[PDB]
Design a protein around this ligand. Sequence first.
Ligand code: 0KU
Ligand code: NAG
Ligand code: NAG
Ligand code: NAG
Ligand code: NAG
Ligand code: NAG
Ligand code: NAG
Ligand code: NAG
Ligand code: NAG
Ligand code: NAG
Ligand code: NAG
Length: 339
Amino acid sequence: VWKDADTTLFCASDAKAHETEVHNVWATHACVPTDPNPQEIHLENVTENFNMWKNNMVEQMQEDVISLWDQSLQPCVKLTGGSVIKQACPKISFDPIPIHYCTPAGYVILKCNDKNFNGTGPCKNVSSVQCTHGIKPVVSTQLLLNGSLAEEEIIIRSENLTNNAKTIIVHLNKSVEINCTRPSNGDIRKAYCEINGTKWNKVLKQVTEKLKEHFNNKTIIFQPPSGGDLEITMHSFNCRGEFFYCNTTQLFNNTCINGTITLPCKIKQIINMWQGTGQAMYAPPIDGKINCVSNITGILLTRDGGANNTSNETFRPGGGNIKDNWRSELYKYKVVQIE
Ligand SMILES: Cc1nc([C@@H](NC(=O)C(=O)Nc2ccc(Cl)cc2)[C@@H]2CCCCN2)sc1CO
Ligand SMILES: *[C@@H]1O[C@H](CO)[C@@H](O)[C@H](O)[C@H]1NC(C)=O
Ligand SMILES: *[C@@H]1O[C@H](CO)[C@@H](O)[C@H](O)[C@H]1NC(C)=O
Ligand SMILES: *[C@@H]1O[C@H](CO)[C@@H](O)[C@H](O)[C@H]1NC(C)=O
Ligand SMILES: *[C@@H]1O[C@H](CO)[C@@H](O)[C@H](O)[C@H]1NC(C)=O
Ligand SMILES: *[C@@H]1O[C@H](CO)[C@@H](O)[C@H](O)[C@H]1NC(C)=O
Ligand SMILES: *[C@@H]1O[C@H](CO)[C@@H](O)[C@H](O)[C@H]1NC(C)=O
Ligand SMILES: *[C@@H]1O[C@H](CO)[C@@H](O)[C@H](O)[C@H]1NC(C)=O
Ligand SMILES: *[C@@H]1O[C@H](CO)[C@@H](O)[C@H](O)[C@H]1NC(C)=O
Ligand SMILES: *[C@@H]1O[C@H](CO)[C@@H](O)[C@H](O)[C@H]1NC(C)=O
Ligand SMILES: *[C@@H]1O[C@H](CO)[C@@H](O)[C@H](O)[C@H]1NC(C)=O
């Protein structure tokens, strides 16, 4: 017999003790080795209610990635709350590794295995595990990168779709590669992302069809963000330690619903921190071909309000709350206490 509970979790990873890469270093000192033969009990005839939007596992992972970044990614200048902090800002090795989240004795993680589970409500196919699947702490906006893919069909997630101030998490069932490079050899910050056109448009079209199911068959319209900070208006992400801000106008513009889509990007040194502290300045880009190929496995959308009297619903790429990134991977899990 069990009950929903919150407890302090621990982590497991396959980090290398000899890696200088910051994720390996953190996990080496903060996590344990993974279980090579994980046990999983499938619970017959059990219905459990889940709520991805109010899950303490999310808060706890956020606390980790903040801790990791504080120890690993110190900027030259911190601009937090009036005070200014000047530190050394050496170039580090950066590549996220899978992190597992686990329950101590007396507790178990319940895992929803329903095919098209949207993250909230009753789950019919529930199993018990000690650890989650390995989750990379990939920080980004607009597009979710290198995440897990939806099993059956594309899934739309929201705490309350009727509320437009609530972020929408689109979960893809097929990866679309995004090829981002800062070439080696006029502008050392100029960079670009390359996406297969037909692949992306086909997927976006599938996303639109899925959105119609949730919005009474109204016509779905994509638009670029209207305002806000660059971290929101642009697909921001970190590649090899470098902060990339990419223009995604070509992605979200219902013209093609063929060829390679080349998004203009720039590596920024001065960043509004996702931690919510303030602003931070980092060192200029390293030399050489800075390249990161990632799977787009999800989209963060924000819906335009004031459309109730029209047939259109307008969706713009969003983000900013990195907890949403962890929700997209932690939705099928909740912690219960065993009695
Ligand atoms: C204080 C605070 N500010 C936050 C802001 N979010 C960010 O600054 C942010 O994500 N920055 C960011 C920085 C680097 C990368 Cl690679 C990706 C994102 C929000 C986003 C949404 C609208 C307003 N700006 S998140 C947050 C947490 O409390
Ligand atoms: C998910 O399914 C639940 C019922 O299981 C339903 O109440 C809720 O509206 C759905 N959420 C979304 C975003 O489709
Ligand atoms: C639970 O998932 C299994 C495997 O996909 C499926 O066979 C079964 O029908 C699901 N249970 C129900 C009744 O939704
Ligand atoms: C990228 O996507 C492909 C195709 O789905 C997948 O096989 C591969 O594991 C993904 N790589 C990741 C998750 O980094
Ligand atoms: C992805 O999901 C969509 C519906 O959202 C479905 O039509 C399509 O078959 C899925 N793609 C694959 C290849 O599973
Ligand atoms: C969803 O949001 C709408 C619009 O803000 C609101 O009227 C409604 O109460 C919300 N639903 C729930 C379950 O709170
Ligand atoms: C990424 O794009 C560059 C050209 O801009 C190319 O040299 C490289 O091969 C690409 N990577 C892949 C795997 O397509
Ligand atoms: C349009 O969407 C509704 C649900 O909103 C669906 O029931 C209906 O079948 C769709 N229109 C078609 C395919 O005739
Ligand atoms: C993105 O590029 C387009 C031109 O392709 C430009 O009109 C738009 O202002 C850019 N967006 C941002 C946020 O700079
Ligand atoms: C994208 O992938 C398709 C196959 O799905 C291929 O035919 C096409 O050449 C690719 N397009 C680009 C931009 O390379
Ligand atoms: C996504 O996964 C690939 C494959 O490991 C990796 O090379 C790349 O750095 C990842 N992208 C991001 C944003 O970290």
